[PDB]
Amino acid sequence: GLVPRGSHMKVLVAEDQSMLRDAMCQLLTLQPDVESVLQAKNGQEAIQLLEKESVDIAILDVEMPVKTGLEVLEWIRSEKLETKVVVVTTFKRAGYFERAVKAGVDAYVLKERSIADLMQTLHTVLEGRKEYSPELMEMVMTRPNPLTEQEIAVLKGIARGLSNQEIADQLYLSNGTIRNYVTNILSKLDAGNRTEAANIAKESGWL
Amino acid sequence: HMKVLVAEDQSMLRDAMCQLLTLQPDVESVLQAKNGQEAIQLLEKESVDIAILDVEMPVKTGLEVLEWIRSEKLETKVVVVTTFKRAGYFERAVKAGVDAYVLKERSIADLMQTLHTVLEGRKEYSPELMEMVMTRPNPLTEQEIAVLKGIARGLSNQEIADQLYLSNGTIRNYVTNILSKLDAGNRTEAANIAKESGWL
Ligand code: BEF
Ligand code: BEF
Ligand SMILES: [Mg+2]
Ligand SMILES: [Mg+2]
């Protein structure tokens, strides 16, 4: 995915806080590696701009009037533009990050970063790489135990080679109830069979 | 020329502001703080011409830093720069003798101009917040207004009473209430104040 324009990159900055937008764009414009900087105060303006000219990188705030940066991202991808996308946001919201990634954002970074981190992100994405806020990564790779107390009992049962019927007797439940729980457990753990689910749940520290 | 301090807890904005101020021909140096506690520590050991202060920051807000500056009687002009349009923040800053109070809706060139404005001994108050604060509801009741319109026409209390179908004692009660509401020493003066304040 390397785009060989890193010595003269055309970028767009969409950001609704005027003072920040102004200061970002002035400093980007000053960089030897930046050729030009388009400026947008909200998502609708970003999209109108992108309808009328090409940029190498769209740098996008999330919370903006009219259209958010996530909506602009989703629009750039539906248009198959030859444009990298970097989301730059205050919000450490796991859901925003997930949405961005599903629409193939190239970077997602927090306004806890500096302008130097930002320049580094720009080069990273323009050389075809990805950069994800470590802090958001961490947030999302940490999951609660998804298993109910029953399902945990079932899985312990499974871990001893017990049949569904044997587990039903132990837990004082019907065989059909155990079968449900098993089916349910394969879904929550994306395991293929009952023995797979058991080691995934053990390996993940959930028993 | 200008020795400035910037206190701002959003790292990207702080960094961007500081780098740009530093680039200005008539800024000599820029001190950097990410919270009001750091701002005060810097101000304790270093002299500064202007301190540019975010309101909401960790530990100490720009409003507390402002107050500290003033209590210390520092020869430092203070410019607050904030996202927030909360009237209490604005009113608290003016009462503390802030020199400017502007919104992050303004540009860097706006900010530069503000810096020169305050070093000239002038003030710069967000037009939008000024108008918000200066806009209140009529402090008079519909009945109090009727009495005052009556006073302006030269009517006596009894004449106003008979016009409004009320006892002259009720009218006296209104008048007593109006004089206190408007800080007027007499009825004719209360009427003059209400009319010219645009409340009649
Ligand atoms: F408006 Be935010 F920084 F997404
Ligand atoms: F943090 Be705010 F802009 F006072
Ligand atoms: Mg925003
Ligand atoms: Mg703040």
Tab-separated table of C-alpha atoms and ligand atoms in Angstrom:
chain	number	residue	atom	x	y	z
A	1	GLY	CA	0.000	0.000	0.000
A	2	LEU	CA	2.987	2.451	-0.173
A	3	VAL	CA	2.234	5.690	-1.873
A	4	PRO	CA	5.548	7.340	-2.943
A	5	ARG	CA	4.603	10.943	-2.169
A	6	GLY	CA	5.992	11.183	1.315
A	7	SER	CA	8.181	14.161	0.280
A	8	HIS	CA	5.160	16.136	-0.983
A	9	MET	CA	1.967	14.800	0.559
A	10	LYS	CA	-1.453	16.398	-0.038
A	11	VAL	CA	-3.577	16.184	3.079
A	12	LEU	CA	-6.992	17.303	4.317
A	13	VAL	CA	-7.696	18.170	7.966
A	14	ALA	CA	-11.317	17.970	9.195
A	15	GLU	CA	-11.711	19.370	12.723
A	16	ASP	CA	-14.487	21.485	14.297
A	17	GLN	CA	-12.500	23.205	17.029
A	18	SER	CA	-11.257	26.231	15.097
A	19	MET	CA	-8.164	27.035	17.078
A	20	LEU	CA	-6.846	23.453	16.891
A	21	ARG	CA	-7.679	23.115	13.206
A	22	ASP	CA	-5.847	26.389	12.469
A	23	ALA	CA	-2.763	25.507	14.506
A	24	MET	CA	-2.558	21.962	13.047
A	25	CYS	CA	-2.858	23.119	9.484
A	26	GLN	CA	-0.351	25.947	9.807
A	27	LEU	CA	2.232	23.576	11.234
A	28	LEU	CA	1.558	20.790	8.733
A	29	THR	CA	1.878	23.366	5.955
A	30	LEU	CA	5.284	24.247	7.326
A	31	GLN	CA	6.638	20.690	7.172
A	32	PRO	CA	9.098	19.955	4.308
A	33	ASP	CA	7.170	16.762	3.526
A	34	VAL	CA	3.733	18.412	3.152
A	35	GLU	CA	2.804	20.011	-0.163
A	36	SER	CA	-0.690	21.255	0.639
A	37	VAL	CA	-3.345	21.162	3.380
A	38	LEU	CA	-7.110	21.318	2.851
A	39	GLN	CA	-9.184	22.424	5.767
A	40	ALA	CA	-12.722	21.414	6.806
A	41	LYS	CA	-14.746	22.444	9.890
A	42	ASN	CA	-17.131	19.519	9.710
A	43	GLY	CA	-17.700	16.225	7.963
A	44	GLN	CA	-20.009	17.558	5.301
A	45	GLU	CA	-17.370	20.113	4.223
A	46	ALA	CA	-14.749	17.307	4.160
A	47	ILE	CA	-16.869	15.253	1.797
A	48	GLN	CA	-17.629	18.209	-0.500
A	49	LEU	CA	-13.943	18.909	-0.697
A	50	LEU	CA	-13.099	15.318	-1.475
A	51	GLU	CA	-15.721	15.365	-4.250
A	52	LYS	CA	-13.714	18.035	-6.040
A	53	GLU	CA	-10.106	17.097	-5.376
A	54	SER	CA	-7.684	14.290	-4.546
A	55	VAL	CA	-5.791	14.002	-1.287
A	56	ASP	CA	-3.201	11.440	-0.118
A	57	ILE	CA	-4.350	11.520	3.492
A	58	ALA	CA	-7.585	12.614	5.157
A	59	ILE	CA	-7.013	13.477	8.792
A	60	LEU	CA	-10.351	13.320	10.586
A	61	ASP	CA	-11.783	14.367	13.912
A	62	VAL	CA	-14.634	12.111	15.089
A	63	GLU	CA	-17.127	14.531	16.731
A	64	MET	CA	-18.045	17.189	14.237
A	65	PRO	CA	-21.300	18.811	13.095
A	66	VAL	CA	-23.463	17.375	10.346
A	67	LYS	CA	-21.251	14.359	9.502
A	68	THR	CA	-18.752	12.749	11.914
A	69	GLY	CA	-15.244	11.621	10.937
A	70	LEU	CA	-16.432	8.007	11.101
A	71	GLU	CA	-19.110	8.794	8.521
A	72	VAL	CA	-16.555	10.594	6.340
A	73	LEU	CA	-14.257	7.520	6.638
A	74	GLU	CA	-17.131	5.281	5.612
A	75	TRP	CA	-17.854	7.574	2.647
A	76	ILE	CA	-14.216	7.686	1.469
A	77	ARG	CA	-14.161	3.878	1.427
A	78	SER	CA	-17.489	3.625	-0.390
A	79	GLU	CA	-16.002	5.951	-2.996
A	80	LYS	CA	-12.814	3.763	-3.229
A	81	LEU	CA	-10.632	6.892	-3.045
A	82	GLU	CA	-6.841	6.460	-3.158
A	83	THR	CA	-6.635	8.140	0.286
A	84	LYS	CA	-5.214	6.999	3.598
A	85	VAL	CA	-7.339	7.907	6.626
A	86	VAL	CA	-6.104	8.964	10.054
A	87	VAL	CA	-8.670	9.570	12.830
A	88	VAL	CA	-7.501	12.041	15.458
A	89	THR	CA	-9.899	12.338	18.453
A	90	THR	CA	-10.229	13.085	22.157
A	91	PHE	CA	-12.457	10.058	22.596
A	92	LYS	CA	-11.143	6.857	24.064
A	93	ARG	CA	-14.460	5.081	23.198
A	94	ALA	CA	-13.977	1.428	22.276
A	95	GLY	CA	-16.938	1.551	19.951
A	96	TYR	CA	-15.642	4.383	17.841
A	97	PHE	CA	-12.311	2.557	17.382
A	98	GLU	CA	-14.123	-0.694	16.422
A	99	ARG	CA	-16.207	1.088	13.805
A	100	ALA	CA	-13.131	2.814	12.355
A	101	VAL	CA	-11.258	-0.454	12.049
A	102	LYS	CA	-14.179	-2.218	10.414
A	103	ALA	CA	-14.250	0.512	7.774
A	104	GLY	CA	-10.456	-0.011	7.327
A	105	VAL	CA	-9.098	3.188	8.923
A	106	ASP	CA	-5.298	3.375	8.515
A	107	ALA	CA	-4.718	5.057	11.873
A	108	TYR	CA	-6.659	5.986	14.998
A	109	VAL	CA	-4.888	8.204	17.498
A	110	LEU	CA	-5.748	10.333	20.502
A	111	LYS	CA	-5.181	14.127	20.999
A	112	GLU	CA	-2.892	13.048	23.856
A	113	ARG	CA	-0.358	12.706	20.961
A	114	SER	CA	1.964	15.495	19.764
A	115	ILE	CA	2.308	17.030	16.301
A	116	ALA	CA	5.483	14.970	15.979
A	117	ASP	CA	3.572	11.761	16.686
A	118	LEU	CA	1.081	12.966	14.079
A	119	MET	CA	3.736	13.494	11.431
A	120	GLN	CA	5.050	10.008	12.162
A	121	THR	CA	1.499	8.573	11.765
A	122	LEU	CA	1.128	10.314	8.437
A	123	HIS	CA	4.346	8.721	7.111
A	124	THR	CA	3.405	5.367	8.587
A	125	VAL	CA	0.063	5.228	6.786
A	126	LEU	CA	1.442	6.655	3.558
A	127	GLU	CA	4.054	3.833	3.494
A	128	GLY	CA	1.107	1.427	3.658
A	129	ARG	CA	1.194	0.674	7.364
A	130	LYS	CA	-1.303	0.968	10.211
A	131	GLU	CA	-1.133	2.742	13.521
A	132	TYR	CA	-3.547	2.146	16.315
A	133	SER	CA	-3.722	3.917	19.657
A	134	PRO	CA	-2.042	1.373	21.999
A	135	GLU	CA	-4.314	2.514	24.719
A	136	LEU	CA	-7.457	1.729	22.696
A	137	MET	CA	-5.923	-1.582	21.577
A	138	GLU	CA	-5.379	-2.504	25.194
A	139	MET	CA	-8.952	-1.479	26.066
A	140	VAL	CA	-10.432	-3.726	23.436
A	141	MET	CA	-8.163	-6.807	23.843
A	142	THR	CA	-9.336	-7.006	27.480
A	143	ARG	CA	-12.640	-8.846	27.706
A	144	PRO	CA	-14.776	-9.810	30.711
A	145	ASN	CA	-15.430	-13.497	31.329
A	146	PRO	CA	-18.282	-14.096	28.862
A	147	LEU	CA	-19.401	-17.336	30.545
A	148	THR	CA	-22.304	-17.581	33.031
A	149	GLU	CA	-21.825	-19.535	36.277
A	150	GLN	CA	-23.680	-22.471	34.724
A	151	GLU	CA	-21.605	-22.520	31.563
A	152	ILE	CA	-18.444	-22.480	33.682
A	153	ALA	CA	-19.741	-25.559	35.567
A	154	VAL	CA	-20.548	-27.251	32.258
A	155	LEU	CA	-17.062	-26.526	30.916
A	156	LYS	CA	-15.359	-27.907	34.020
A	157	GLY	CA	-17.530	-30.974	33.469
A	158	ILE	CA	-16.430	-31.171	29.873
A	159	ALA	CA	-12.825	-30.842	30.960
A	160	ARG	CA	-13.110	-34.229	32.689
A	161	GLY	CA	-14.361	-36.091	29.624
A	162	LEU	CA	-17.914	-36.086	30.998
A	163	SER	CA	-20.815	-36.576	28.606
A	164	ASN	CA	-23.628	-34.052	28.400
A	165	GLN	CA	-25.870	-36.516	30.296
A	166	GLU	CA	-23.262	-36.949	33.047
A	167	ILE	CA	-23.007	-33.144	33.389
A	168	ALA	CA	-26.794	-32.891	33.497
A	169	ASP	CA	-26.875	-35.349	36.396
A	170	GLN	CA	-24.107	-33.459	38.238
A	171	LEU	CA	-25.799	-30.082	37.823
A	172	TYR	CA	-29.277	-31.458	38.428
A	173	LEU	CA	-30.423	-30.298	34.978
A	174	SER	CA	-31.989	-31.917	31.926
A	175	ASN	CA	-29.817	-33.202	29.093
A	176	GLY	CA	-31.543	-30.684	26.767
A	177	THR	CA	-30.510	-27.831	29.043
A	178	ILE	CA	-26.857	-28.969	28.976
A	179	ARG	CA	-27.021	-29.228	25.128
A	180	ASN	CA	-28.266	-25.613	24.939
A	181	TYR	CA	-25.453	-24.398	27.244
A	182	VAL	CA	-22.902	-26.238	25.084
A	183	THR	CA	-24.250	-24.768	21.873
A	184	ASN	CA	-24.220	-21.370	23.542
A	185	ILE	CA	-20.641	-21.901	24.732
A	186	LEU	CA	-19.323	-22.741	21.244
A	187	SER	CA	-20.770	-19.424	20.014
A	188	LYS	CA	-19.351	-17.227	22.781
A	189	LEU	CA	-15.874	-18.731	22.482
A	190	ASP	CA	-15.873	-19.428	18.724
A	191	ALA	CA	-14.937	-23.009	19.411
A	192	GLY	CA	-15.689	-25.751	16.918
A	193	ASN	CA	-16.355	-28.708	19.226
A	194	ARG	CA	-16.920	-29.240	22.968
A	195	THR	CA	-13.278	-30.107	23.716
A	196	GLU	CA	-12.007	-27.024	21.835
A	197	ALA	CA	-14.216	-24.762	23.934
A	198	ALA	CA	-12.870	-26.249	27.141
A	199	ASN	CA	-9.207	-25.544	26.434
A	200	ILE	CA	-9.992	-22.053	25.023
A	201	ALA	CA	-11.832	-21.269	28.259
A	202	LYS	CA	-8.995	-22.678	30.377
A	203	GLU	CA	-6.250	-21.098	28.256
A	204	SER	CA	-8.154	-17.786	28.676
A	205	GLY	CA	-8.312	-18.090	32.474
A	206	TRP	CA	-12.104	-18.266	32.695
A	207	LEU	CA	-12.574	-21.508	34.700
B	1	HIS	CA	9.732	40.840	23.062
B	2	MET	CA	6.918	38.571	24.320
B	3	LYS	CA	7.645	36.086	27.034
B	4	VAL	CA	4.600	33.865	27.219
B	5	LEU	CA	3.320	30.846	29.144
B	6	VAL	CA	0.785	28.386	27.814
B	7	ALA	CA	-1.244	26.150	30.123
B	8	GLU	CA	-3.448	23.640	28.349
B	9	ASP	CA	-4.125	19.982	29.159
B	10	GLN	CA	-4.869	18.740	25.626
B	11	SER	CA	-1.435	17.659	24.458
B	12	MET	CA	-1.864	18.091	20.740
B	13	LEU	CA	-3.343	21.598	21.113
B	14	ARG	CA	-0.781	22.650	23.688
B	15	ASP	CA	2.021	21.430	21.476
B	16	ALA	CA	0.581	23.036	18.376
B	17	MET	CA	-0.071	26.396	20.152
B	18	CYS	CA	3.362	26.499	21.671
B	19	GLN	CA	5.212	25.655	18.499
B	20	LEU	CA	3.298	28.340	16.595
B	21	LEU	CA	3.639	31.078	19.189
B	22	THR	CA	7.363	30.317	19.286
B	23	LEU	CA	7.495	30.931	15.532
B	24	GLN	CA	5.965	34.446	15.814
B	25	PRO	CA	8.488	37.289	15.331
B	26	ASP	CA	7.443	39.127	18.501
B	27	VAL	CA	7.353	36.102	20.776
B	28	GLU	CA	10.703	35.670	22.439
B	29	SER	CA	9.962	32.461	24.323
B	30	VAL	CA	7.078	30.136	25.265
B	31	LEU	CA	6.832	28.255	28.608
B	32	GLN	CA	4.720	25.064	28.564
B	33	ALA	CA	2.372	23.733	31.251
B	34	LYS	CA	-0.133	20.850	30.987
B	35	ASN	CA	-1.979	21.804	34.169
B	36	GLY	CA	-2.487	24.793	36.510
B	37	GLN	CA	-0.186	23.331	39.111
B	38	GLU	CA	2.623	23.259	36.558
B	39	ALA	CA	1.699	26.820	35.496
B	40	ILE	CA	2.096	28.151	39.028
B	41	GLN	CA	5.433	26.322	39.514
B	42	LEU	CA	6.781	27.936	36.399
B	43	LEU	CA	5.494	31.354	37.369
B	44	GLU	CA	7.264	31.018	40.747
B	45	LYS	CA	10.756	30.800	39.225
B	46	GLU	CA	10.391	32.545	35.876
B	47	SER	CA	9.064	35.947	34.855
B	48	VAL	CA	6.395	36.065	32.206
B	49	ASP	CA	4.780	38.881	30.208
B	50	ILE	CA	1.600	36.958	29.411
B	51	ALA	CA	0.027	33.752	30.661
B	52	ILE	CA	-2.400	32.028	28.369
B	53	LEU	CA	-4.583	29.687	30.302
B	54	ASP	CA	-7.048	26.898	29.589
B	55	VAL	CA	-9.882	26.723	32.116
B	56	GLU	CA	-10.497	22.990	32.727
B	57	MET	CA	-7.200	21.350	33.615
B	58	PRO	CA	-6.036	18.734	36.197
B	59	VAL	CA	-5.239	19.777	39.787
B	60	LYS	CA	-5.563	23.573	39.288
B	61	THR	CA	-7.870	25.272	36.726
B	62	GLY	CA	-6.825	28.367	34.789
B	63	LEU	CA	-9.240	30.348	36.957
B	64	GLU	CA	-7.327	29.332	40.085
B	65	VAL	CA	-4.033	30.091	38.351
B	66	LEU	CA	-5.442	33.496	37.449
B	67	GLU	CA	-6.398	34.174	41.060
B	68	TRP	CA	-2.938	33.109	42.241
B	69	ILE	CA	-1.274	35.379	39.718
B	70	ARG	CA	-3.278	38.332	40.999
B	71	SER	CA	-2.822	37.569	44.714
B	72	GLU	CA	0.915	37.415	44.049
B	73	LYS	CA	0.559	40.774	42.219
B	74	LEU	CA	2.620	39.459	39.292
B	75	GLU	CA	3.325	41.862	36.383
B	76	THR	CA	1.711	39.347	34.046
B	77	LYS	CA	-1.244	39.850	31.750
B	78	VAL	CA	-3.659	36.893	31.649
B	79	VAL	CA	-5.528	35.564	28.598
B	80	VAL	CA	-7.963	32.703	29.180
B	81	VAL	CA	-8.541	30.461	26.158
B	82	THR	CA	-11.272	27.820	26.508
B	83	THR	CA	-13.824	25.629	24.786
B	84	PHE	CA	-16.480	26.418	27.386
B	85	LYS	CA	-19.240	28.990	27.144
B	86	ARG	CA	-20.248	28.628	30.791
B	87	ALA	CA	-21.170	32.101	32.147
B	88	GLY	CA	-19.866	31.361	35.643
B	89	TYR	CA	-16.398	30.754	34.247
B	90	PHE	CA	-16.454	34.031	32.355
B	91	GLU	CA	-17.880	36.030	35.264
B	92	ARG	CA	-15.455	34.516	37.698
B	93	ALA	CA	-12.528	35.458	35.389
B	94	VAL	CA	-13.593	39.113	34.911
B	95	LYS	CA	-14.134	39.467	38.646
B	96	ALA	CA	-10.565	38.168	39.101
B	97	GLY	CA	-9.245	40.808	36.701
B	98	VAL	CA	-8.575	38.613	33.670
B	99	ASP	CA	-7.233	40.698	30.748
B	100	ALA	CA	-8.811	38.605	27.981
B	101	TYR	CA	-11.229	35.666	27.770
B	102	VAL	CA	-11.661	34.115	24.378
B	103	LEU	CA	-13.083	30.916	22.956
B	104	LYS	CA	-11.273	28.151	21.028
B	105	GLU	CA	-13.666	29.195	18.222
B	106	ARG	CA	-11.102	31.982	17.589
B	107	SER	CA	-8.014	31.602	15.342
B	108	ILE	CA	-4.319	31.821	16.163
B	109	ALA	CA	-4.222	35.224	14.454
B	110	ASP	CA	-7.099	36.265	16.696
B	111	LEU	CA	-5.015	35.057	19.651
B	112	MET	CA	-1.910	36.997	18.509
B	113	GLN	CA	-3.941	40.183	18.252
B	114	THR	CA	-5.266	39.510	21.755
B	115	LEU	CA	-1.742	39.183	23.078
B	116	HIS	CA	-0.848	42.626	21.692
B	117	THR	CA	-4.158	44.027	22.952
B	118	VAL	CA	-3.534	43.085	26.552
B	119	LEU	CA	0.126	44.158	26.590
B	120	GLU	CA	-1.292	47.549	25.523
B	121	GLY	CA	-3.302	47.661	28.748
B	122	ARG	CA	-6.605	47.014	26.997
B	123	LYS	CA	-9.068	44.147	27.572
B	124	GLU	CA	-10.563	41.579	25.214
B	125	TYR	CA	-13.757	39.826	26.223
B	126	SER	CA	-15.439	37.179	24.071
B	127	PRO	CA	-18.209	39.097	22.232
B	128	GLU	CA	-20.447	36.048	22.371
B	129	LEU	CA	-20.052	35.568	26.132
B	130	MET	CA	-20.505	39.329	26.759
B	131	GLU	CA	-23.806	39.346	24.953
B	132	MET	CA	-24.947	36.146	26.718
B	133	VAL	CA	-24.190	37.601	30.120
B	134	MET	CA	-25.659	41.042	29.361
B	135	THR	CA	-28.938	39.494	28.214
B	136	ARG	CA	-31.368	39.064	31.090
B	137	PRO	CA	-35.135	38.909	31.428
B	138	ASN	CA	-37.060	41.994	32.414
B	139	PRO	CA	-36.626	42.146	36.206
B	140	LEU	CA	-40.134	43.591	36.496
B	141	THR	CA	-43.504	41.880	36.799
B	142	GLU	CA	-46.263	42.797	34.394
B	143	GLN	CA	-47.971	44.555	37.302
B	144	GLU	CA	-44.849	46.436	38.353
B	145	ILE	CA	-44.473	47.642	34.771
B	146	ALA	CA	-48.064	48.960	34.760
B	147	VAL	CA	-47.474	50.946	37.944
B	148	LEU	CA	-44.224	52.391	36.499
B	149	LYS	CA	-45.917	53.373	33.228
B	150	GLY	CA	-48.438	55.114	35.473
B	151	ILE	CA	-45.727	56.918	37.469
B	152	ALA	CA	-44.124	58.089	34.189
B	153	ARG	CA	-47.472	59.681	33.199
B	154	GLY	CA	-47.410	61.665	36.476
B	155	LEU	CA	-50.205	59.668	38.146
B	156	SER	CA	-50.499	59.555	41.920
B	157	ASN	CA	-50.697	56.223	43.727
B	158	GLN	CA	-54.460	56.651	44.067
B	159	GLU	CA	-54.828	57.365	40.376
B	160	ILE	CA	-52.758	54.269	39.545
B	161	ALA	CA	-54.838	52.239	42.032
B	162	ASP	CA	-58.084	53.244	40.368
B	163	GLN	CA	-56.695	52.579	36.898
B	164	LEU	CA	-55.591	49.038	37.863
B	165	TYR	CA	-58.605	48.322	40.083
B	166	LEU	CA	-56.400	47.817	43.157
B	167	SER	CA	-56.183	49.358	46.608
B	168	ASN	CA	-53.746	52.213	46.927
B	169	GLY	CA	-52.044	49.988	49.562
B	170	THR	CA	-51.325	47.382	46.935
B	171	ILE	CA	-49.832	50.105	44.755
B	172	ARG	CA	-47.665	51.247	47.681
B	173	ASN	CA	-46.464	47.636	48.053
B	174	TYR	CA	-45.525	47.543	44.404
B	175	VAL	CA	-43.636	50.809	44.675
B	176	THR	CA	-41.803	49.592	47.774
B	177	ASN	CA	-40.894	46.413	45.886
B	178	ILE	CA	-39.760	48.380	42.757
B	179	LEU	CA	-37.533	50.753	44.676
B	180	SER	CA	-35.702	47.758	46.143
B	181	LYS	CA	-35.542	45.832	42.860
B	182	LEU	CA	-34.146	48.795	40.946
B	183	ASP	CA	-32.150	50.535	43.738
B	184	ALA	CA	-34.095	53.778	43.227
B	185	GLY	CA	-34.597	56.379	45.906
B	186	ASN	CA	-38.025	57.443	44.718
B	187	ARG	CA	-40.870	56.559	42.377
B	188	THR	CA	-40.091	59.062	39.596
B	189	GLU	CA	-36.473	57.951	39.532
B	190	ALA	CA	-37.595	54.276	39.469
B	191	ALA	CA	-39.687	55.065	36.392
B	192	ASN	CA	-36.827	56.862	34.664
B	193	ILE	CA	-34.533	53.853	35.314
B	194	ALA	CA	-37.046	51.305	34.020
B	195	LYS	CA	-37.782	53.279	30.832
B	196	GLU	CA	-34.167	53.910	29.895
B	197	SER	CA	-33.159	50.314	30.760
B	198	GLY	CA	-35.761	49.359	28.146
B	199	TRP	CA	-38.086	47.581	30.600
B	200	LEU	CA	-41.321	49.557	29.793
C	1	BEF	F1	-14.302	16.090	18.373
C	1	BEF	BE1	-13.397	14.888	18.774
C	1	BEF	F2	-11.871	15.168	19.011
C	1	BEF	F3	-13.613	13.581	17.935
C	2	BEF	F1	-10.244	22.778	28.905
C	2	BEF	BE1	-11.143	23.999	28.495
C	2	BEF	F2	-10.912	24.558	27.092
C	2	BEF	F3	-11.064	25.157	29.510
C	3	MG	MG	-14.828	17.659	17.312
C	4	MG	MG	-8.707	21.696	29.326
